[PDB]
Amino acid sequence: SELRIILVGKTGTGKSAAGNSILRKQAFESKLGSQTLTKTCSKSQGSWGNREIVIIDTPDMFSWKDHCEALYKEVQRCYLLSAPGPHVLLLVTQLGRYTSQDQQAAQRVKEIFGEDAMGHTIVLFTHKEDLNGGSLMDYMHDSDNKALSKLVAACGGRICAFNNRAEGSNQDDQVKELMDCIEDLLMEKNGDHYTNGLYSLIVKEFKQSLIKYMETQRSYT
Incomplete structure (x- = not known):
């Protein structure tokens, strides 16, 4: 019943702080009055409506x-x-x-x-x-x-x-709105999470496959 969320976005838009709003704690580094730049992935966990929420924050370079x-x-x-x-x-x-x-x-x-x-x-x-x-x-x-x-x-x-x-x-309402959007999405997907060949595979083997996967995706775009 756990819910896994990945955060992504252009530098400066506040994805880490959004993660913190959702979890209702300072889960990810984000300091008022300073610009955030996330260098490495990290994870934090909380809850909403009796289910565990797992959030993965990503490095800004994913967006570059x-x-x-x-x-x-x-x-x-x-x-x-x-x-x-x-x-x-x-x-x-x-x-x-x-x-x-x-x-x-x-x-x-x-x-x-x-x-x-x-x-x-x-x-x-x-x-x-x-x-x-x-x-x-x-x-x-x-x-x-x-x-x-x-x-x-x-x-x-x-x-x-x-x-x-x-x-x-104000905070409770925005997080509820997000959770309602998530619930509607999951209802439509019969509760399924997204997956792909790289998740199926789950260090050198993964790296080689990822490079090929990304090259293929660039073509489709």
Whole structure:
């Protein structure tokens, strides 16, 4: 009955702080008034509605253009920490600021986890206060950002808004909204988690397979 979530997103959008909001603790390094840069994967756990939540935070470099040795090592770490596969990938973006770099982060999710990972992805929008009291759905409807529309479509319209600084009922409400989105997704998937050939495989063997897998995914994109 455990729920495994992987966090991804463009640098500066606040994915680690979103993880902390969900778990209601300082699970991942994130300091008010400073910019976060996550160098290595880590995991933390909490609960919601009597089930255990396992969150895997990823290095910022997953979202970048790079293919260094450390990248392959950390991807293998991410797969080991999230095995036998994530129920949800949470792609973290800042409201009103979906740029080429967010597009790259989305492309990298497909590269690292497979294009079909979009079918278990939910788009988070941080800085929800910038809706100025309007609804997120109206914001999506009225947005002329074509790349953002394409991401939201790939994700089956699954979206949620957060203020990472939320407290009390504001915090409880945003986490509940996310959990409701997750529950709807899992109902539709008969409770299935996402998986792929690399999860099935689960150090040198994995590395070689991952490089080939990523190359294949780049072509599809």
